[PDB]
């Protein structure tokens, strides 16, 4: 055991030296002369009410109009953002809901929680209602994130050291990824859906190849649990929000961290991270009931979105990039334009 | 607006009405989170995946959850139980060997950043077993807890002294950690006690009474 530990330490030292040998200058030095971004003021265009309990997750959908939101009341609602109308309100078997996902085609919606089961609901039914299509069971631990590759394949992240890919038809795990040490808290699919990343409760974000089911790289720059991850729109970088009140930007091509977004007035951890259409405004939701907008190329703080009376649990940006929807623990969703 | 938009608005209004009715129906049941150890016997305190137990006392419905089948690290799913009425905490008192661990657990769940508003209802089970061990046998709390030697009482006096010492040890952490946001409710229950439901009912009654008093700024 001692020989293996020594070999692992030597390999880690070699990896660190190789990473250091390829860091000519920080991205901050490169973009020091870049023209800055003025203060951004976004007002609450819409307020969506009717959950009566803490909201835990939300997802927009391929079109930038419909939305889905999951709360601990025991219901999963679908909103028409342009008119604040409720398209659907699906009751759930278990009231402990931790995640929700909207299919790219809009046909199905997935949800999960403490029941260690991913429930998939079919929206467009001949009977005229919403009924449970599938109940993918396993994972021996609570679900924390679900993402749809297409109408037949899903990816789930659980509360153990395991992510999985499910064939919705058969219901069996086509592939399982086991490289983590703590709970996997978030998930983000690549734009081409050939890779993804997973941030775990051990200060580690791992890059998984969705085909062979093996870990490609691991990034360790944080000091506490990672609560949210998100890909850069280009697909060659991503950003992680952790519990040490600090966001970070990692690069796939050169496996290092480029910039860190943190301020001395912030002491509470991040619960949600999203980008902009151009990949310049990093929107991060904090535990101090606020959200912050970071200049992703200069690490500045270009604006504060303060309209919530409790924790900002979920935060997403539409594909069109015309809105930012933040859902908080006070049973309220707000759209900012 | 249009012909197909007023109908959508009416459908949304019906959805809102159904949601409000469901929320009103589900707001009348009090939710309690059950916590404890393997030897604490937390499964059997009230006479009749996640275990769920529904009972009724004085025309009030109580729903009790017992989260099993999950990993040891519980610092991430414990934030789900942030809106519960109370945290029932079952602790075995007849096993001093693992009493300190129980204390640690209590402290950990008492100072949590999210469980500050939730009040804890203690349940020191196996009081008869503790009395039997205190009466006969050579197993003194002095070696496990050095402070029991100098403790005096504020059944024979030995059992009462031990019971009050354990209750004081559990209540000290409850006392020096809050500013009236939540309270501890130490109870002594045997393995065949039948009044646990009434105790939970009364404690929930005054927990929500203190909540109501605090919100109207009356206290």
């Amino acid at each position, epitope marked *: 055991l001692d020989q293996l530990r020594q070999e692992a330490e030597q390999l880690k030292n070699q990896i660190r030296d190789a990473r250091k040998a390829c860091a000519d200058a920080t991205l901050s030095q490169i973009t020091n002369n870049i023209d800055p971004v003025g203060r951004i003021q976004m007002r609450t265009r819409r307020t969506l009410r009717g959950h009566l309990a803490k909201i835990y997750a939300m997802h927009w959908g391929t079109d930038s*109009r*419909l939305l889905v939101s999951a709360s601990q009341d025991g219901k999963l609602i679908i909103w*028409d953002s342009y008119t604040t*109308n409720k*398209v*659907h309100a699906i009751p759930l078997r278990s009231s402990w809901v931790m995640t929700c996902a909207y299919a790219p085609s809009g046909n199905y919606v997935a949800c999960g929680g403490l029941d260690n089961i991913c429930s998939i609901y079919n929206l*467009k039914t*001949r*009977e*005229g*209602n919403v009924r449970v299509s599938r109940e993918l069971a396993g994972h021996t631990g609570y679900l924390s994130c679900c993402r749809f590759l297409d109408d037949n394949q899903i990816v789930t992240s659980s509360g153990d050291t395991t992510c999985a890919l499910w064939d919705i038809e058969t219901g069996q795990q086509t592939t399982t990824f086991t490289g983590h040490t703590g709970d996997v808290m978030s998930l983000s699919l690549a734009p081409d859906t050939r890779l993804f990343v997973s941030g775990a409760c051990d200060a580690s974000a791992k890059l998984w190849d969705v085909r062979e089911g093996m870990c490609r790289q691991t990034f360790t720059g944080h000091e506490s649990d990672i609560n949210a991850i998100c890909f850069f729109p280009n697909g060659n970088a991503f950003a992680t929000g952790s519990d040490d009140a600090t966001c970070r930007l990692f690069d796939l091509r050169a496996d290092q961290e480029l910039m860190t977004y943190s301020h001395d007035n912030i002491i509470c951890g991040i619960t949600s991270v999203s980008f902009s259409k151009s990949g310049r405004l990093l929107l991060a939701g904090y535990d101090d009931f606020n959200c912050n907008v970071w200049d992703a190329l200069k690490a500045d703080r270009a604006g504060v979105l303060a309209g919530h009376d409790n924790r900002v649990s979920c935060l997403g940006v539409t594909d069109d990039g015309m809105a930012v929807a933040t859902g908080s623990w006070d049973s309220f969703l707000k759209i900012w334009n | *607006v*249009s*012909a*197909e*938009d*007023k*109908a*959508a608005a*009416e*459908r949304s209004k*019906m959805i809102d009405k159904n949601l409000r009715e469901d929320g009103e129906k589900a707001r009348r049941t009090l939710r309690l989170l059950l916590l404890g150890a393997d030897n604490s016997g937390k499964s059997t305190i009230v006479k009749q995946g996640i275990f769920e137990t529904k009972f009724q006392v004085d025309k009030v419905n109580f729903h009790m959850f017992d989260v099993g089948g999950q990993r040891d690290e519980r610092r991430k799913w414990i934030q789900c139980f942030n809106d519960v009425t109370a945290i029932i905490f079952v602790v075995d008192s007849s096993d001093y060997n693992r009493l300190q661990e129980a204390l640690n657990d209590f402290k950990s769940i008492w100072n949590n950043r999210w469980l500050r508003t939730i009040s804890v209802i203690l349940f020191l089970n196996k009081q008869d077993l503790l009395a039997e061990k205190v009466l006969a046998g050579k197993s003194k709390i002095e070696d496990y807890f050095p402070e029991f030697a100098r403790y005096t009482t504020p059944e024979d006096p030995r059992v009462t002294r031990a019971k009050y010492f354990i209750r004081k040890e559990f209540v000290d952490i409850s006392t020096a950690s809050g500013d009236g946001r939540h309270i501890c409710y130490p109870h002594f229950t045997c393995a065949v006690d039948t009044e646990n439901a009434r105790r939970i009912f009364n404690d929930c009654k005054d927990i929500i009474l203190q909540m109501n008093l605090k919100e109207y700024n009356l206290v």
Partner: single-chain antibody
Amino acid sequence: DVQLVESGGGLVQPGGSRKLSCSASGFAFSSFGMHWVRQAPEKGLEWVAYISSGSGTIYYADTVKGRFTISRDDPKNTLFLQMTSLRSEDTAMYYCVRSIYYYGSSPFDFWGQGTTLTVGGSDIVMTQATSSVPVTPGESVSISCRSSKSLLHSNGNTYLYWFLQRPGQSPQLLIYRMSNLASGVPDRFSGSGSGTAFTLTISRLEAEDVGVYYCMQHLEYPLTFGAGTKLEL
């Protein structure tokens, strides 16, 4: 197995009273708005009455207002239409049409079998300047429908429904907006047009695509159908 069954009809003396019943099975009846639509013999369709979801809003045609009453049973699955003081005009075939309204839904989805019966100035007038098109299988055809008012709305959605009725069958919804394709129809059918004129195009016509095509508006609530274009041979 969506199913709507109509009952109640026959020979009624003028000035009498009658009741039409519609039994629905296989779908969530309480979540669907319902329409009663009347088709006169050798004539086109004509909207008659409408009851909403939860019996909220009730609408009637201008030729039956104050004489007909449309209601529904939510605990059961039945739709009632009671008529008083029948005339010589209400001799036709009556269908129940289901329609659920949310974002992206398909109104006028399923049409009932139908029950036979033998005894304004501001609404949009919709016409089709064609009565019969001699077609050949395997050839593309086009049907044109013109509306008096522009059906395009400020929402960007223009309301125009294309229905097909095969001989001896109930009408079926072909296209539930300007271009949106109803579920279950083949990809051959297509729809297009500006805000005033609309066109349905059929490519690679088959034998089963022979019958009467109707165009209907849904902007103003008195619903007006077209005269119907007959594709035969």
